[PDB]
Ligand binder design. Structure first.
Ligand SMILES: Cc1cc2nc3c(=O)[nH]c(=O)nc-3n(C[C@H](O)[C@H](O)[C@H](O)COP(=O)(O)OP(=O)(O)OC[C@H]3O[C@@H](n4cnc5c(N)ncnc54)[C@H](O)[C@@H]3O)c2cc1C
Length: 508
DNA sequence: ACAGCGGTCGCAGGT
DNA sequence: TACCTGCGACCGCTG
């Protein structure tokens, strides 16, 4: 066994065993040629990034848990995870030689950074004699094929996108890979010979530098929890079939939706598996909703944003972004800081921003509320600042999805009915008239009557004292007046739309 | 051409 | 309940 070659699967996203072609191919190959190969499933961890502030503690914890679950599952196939510390640029040249790699597989990714990184690896592999198999299993439909089907253009409307993808084939959904037979552990490389635990899963202490930012562990990481959570969500087939996104609550104390987003984001759950489960349920349920609103439709919204994002390296910025309306956002540093930390003085908005920071997930319509307030609705701050904060705090932080919906919400792309504006005060009342959500995440206001808990400034000073929370002392004065600024912002939006119309017809 | 339709998720005030 | 209308007057697509 001093003559074996190594087959490598590289996990970046797709942190799962189920429905993983790139991974299954590796395991099938090893079992086909017994005694021929060694198998190294790996995750590359840059130890320098741990202090990057664009990754919150909660997301680090989620990744830590995911890596441990992935190692446990690989253990059952007579394998394990190898978490190799370093950067791909130095790691691969070293391990290609060290491990005598014959093949390298991974799941493809459309994010710019990932496109250039992978291209470098492909170039190295080519020159070094290592075969590379890539698979597009992160999404149901391959953005490339969708764009090609639509004559070289990413569809910019949902219904057109649907019209294209129903013409495309849906790939077969795989099971978990086969158990490796006659696979002894590979010989230690020079790094392992020095430290036997060099490729072990990172500890919490290792991945999480600021444990004080950790909140309640409501959504544990990993494929196991992913599948358990999915199964629980699909248990009630009526709820699933009649799902309409607009009717789900932003402020329910428990999630009104599936909360599968962190799992789909990391690849802990296969979007293709989830799509298949849904379809089987809809066939059994005669009464059911349709896209855009349906649960299947939500999954297609994921696919839509990935397709437009795949055609635009600047997707996450206003300038140079083909889709994006050019809007004169302003700098408001105090207001930005107050929004960022849930200190706007709008209890509903503050409640949401605090849940987000604490727990890593907020409901889609809660995101609408705070995104609207930040941008077109009140503060007139750029969506790129909001995007940045979300990137830091969300467990499900996704380059394409985050950019896409921020553009939607700011009416910069895809959505253009800017006359519709969420009220920081009224929107939440509909589903939570008593303000239970506010009382929980803004505890200082928990004695306010429902009559003014969404608008504490309506309470007199004597009232404020009787509720044991005086505005300007225990809770902030509202940083702006929604009833005024939103009307003026509407006109700013109309004005900016006009300027863009000129430019568009001006190039003709 | 340029109008009419549809567009995941507005609000307030009706009924 | 779950519709409805006024508000003021958007874009992409279609033909
Ligand atoms: C300003 C803003 C930023 C956002 N940033 C992200 C992000 O960084 N990462 C992320 O995954 N989602 C993001 N979303 C979309 C959406 O809010 C979340 O996907 C959803 O809240 C996750 O909860 P869920 O899993 O219960 O969704 P469900 O309603 O159960 O839907 C199921 C799955 O469909 C997909 N999905 C649902 N809604 C959307 C949507 N609007 N766009 C794309 N895919 C969707 C997700 O994969 C979700 O897990 C953002 C939305 C807004 C308005």
């Amino acid at each position: 066994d001093s003559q074996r070659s190594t087959l490598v699967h590289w996990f970046r996203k797709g942190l799962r065993l189920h429905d993983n072609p790139a991974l299954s191919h590796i395991f099938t190959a090893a079992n086909a040629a017994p005694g021929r190969y060694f198998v190294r499933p790996i995750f590359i961890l840059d130890p320098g990034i741990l202090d990057w502030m664009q990754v919150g503690a909660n997301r680090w914890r989620f990744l830590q848990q995911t890596l441990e679950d992935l190692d446990n599952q690989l253990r059952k196939l007579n394998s394990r995870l190898f978490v190799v510390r370093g950067k791909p640029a130095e790691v691969f040249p070293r391990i290609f030689k060290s491990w005598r790699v014959e093949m390298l597989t991974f799941e493809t990714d459309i994010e710019p950074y990932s496109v250039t990184r992978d291209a470098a690896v492909q170039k190295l592999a080519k020159a070094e004699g290592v075969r590379v198999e890539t698979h597009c299993s992160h999404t149901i439909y391959n953005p490339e094929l969708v764009i090609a089907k639509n004559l070289g253009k990413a569809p910019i409307t949902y219904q057109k996108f649907l019209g294209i993808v129903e013409q495309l084939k849906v790939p077969k959904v795989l099971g978990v890979p086969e158990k490796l037979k006659n696979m002894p552990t590979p010989p230690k490389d020079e790094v392992e010979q020095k430290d036997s635990a060099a490729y072990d899963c990172p500890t919490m202490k290792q991945l999480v530098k600021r444990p004080e930012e950790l909140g309640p562990n409501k959504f544990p990481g990993g494929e196991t929890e992913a599948l358990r959570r999915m199964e629980e969500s699909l248990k009630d087939e009526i709820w699933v079939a009649r799902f309409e996104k607009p009717n789900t609550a932003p402020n329910s104390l428990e999630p009104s939706t599936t909360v599968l987003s962190p799992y789909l984001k990391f690849g802990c759950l296969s979007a293709r598996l989830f799509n298949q489960k849904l379809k089987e349920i809809i066939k059994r349920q005669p009464k059911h909703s349709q896209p855009p609103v349906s649960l299947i439709g939500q999954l297609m919204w994921r696919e839509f944003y990935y397709t437009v994002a795949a055609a635009e390296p600047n997707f996450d910025r206003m300038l140079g972004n083909v889709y994006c309306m050019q809007i004169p956002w302003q700098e408001h540093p105090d207001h930005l800081e107050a929004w960022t930390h849930g200190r706007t003085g709008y209890p509903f908005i503050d409640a949401i921003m605090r849940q987000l920071r604490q727990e890593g997930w907020i409901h889609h319509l809660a995101r609408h509320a705070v995104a609207c307030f930040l941008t077109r609705g009140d503060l007139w701050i750029s969506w790129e600042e909001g995007q940045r904060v979300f990137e830091q705090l969300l467990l499900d932080q996704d380059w394409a999805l985050n950019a896409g919906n921020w553009m939607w919400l700011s009416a910069s792309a895809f959505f253009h009915q800017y006359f519709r504006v969420y009220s920081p005060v009224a929107f939440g009342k509909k589903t939570d008239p008593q303000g239970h959500y506010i009382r929980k995440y803004v505890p200082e206001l928990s004695k306010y009557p429902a009559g003014c808990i969404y608008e504490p400034w309506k309470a007199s000073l004597v009232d404020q004292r009787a509720y044991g929370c005086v505005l300007g002392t225990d809770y902030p004065h509202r940083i702006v007046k929604h009833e005024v600024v939103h009307k003026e912002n509407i006109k700013r939006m109309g004005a900016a739309y006009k300027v863009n119309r000129e430019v568009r017809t001006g190039k003709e």
